[PDB]
Amino acid sequence: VTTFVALYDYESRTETDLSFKKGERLQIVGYNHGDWWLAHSLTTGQTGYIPSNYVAPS
């Protein structure tokens, strides 16, 4: 699968967003030209919204 890598730690602050740690691998399951992407964490298996500027491509 194509993956992005987290640049920073992020603590979930909404009912729909996803917590993740720096360096973790995320599979983006919904791209959007905006501040939020829908991501699937390969570390935890959870799915939710993340800040698009918090990840970089592999």
Numbering used by the authors: 83 to 140
Question: What text does the study give?
Answer:
The Src homology 3 (SH3) domain is a ∼60-residue modular domain that consists of two antiparallel β-sheets orthogonally packed to form a single hydrophobic core. This domain is present in many proteins and regulates critical cellular pathways by recognizing polyproline-rich motifs (PRMs; Kurochkina & Guha, 2013). Three-dimensional domain swapping (3D-DS) is a mechanism by which some proteins can oligomerize by exchanging identical domains or structural elements between monomers.
The structure of this chimera shows eight molecules in the asymmetric unit. It is worth mentioning that the Src_Abl-nSrc chimera has low solubility (∼5 mg ml−1 at pH 5.0 and 7.0) compared with the Scr_Abl-RT and Scr_Abl-2 chimeras, and well diffracting crystals were obtained only after applying micro- and macro-seeding techniques in the presence of lithium chloride and glycerol to increase the protein solubility. At the same time, these conformations are different from those found in the WT c-Src and Abl SH3 domains. Although introducing residues of Abl into the c-Src SH3 domain is expected to increase the number of hydrogen bonds and reduce loop flexibility in all of the chains, residues in the n-Src loop of some chains show high B factors, and the loop has not been fully modelled in two of the eight chains (chain E and H) present in the asymmetric unit. Interestingly, although the conformation of the RT loop is mainly conserved, residues in this loop show the highest B factors in all of the chains. However, Src_Abl-nSrc shows an ordered distal loop in most of the molecules in the asymmetric unit and this chimera does not form the intertwined dimer. Nevertheless, no amyloid formation has been detected for Scr_Abl-nSrc.
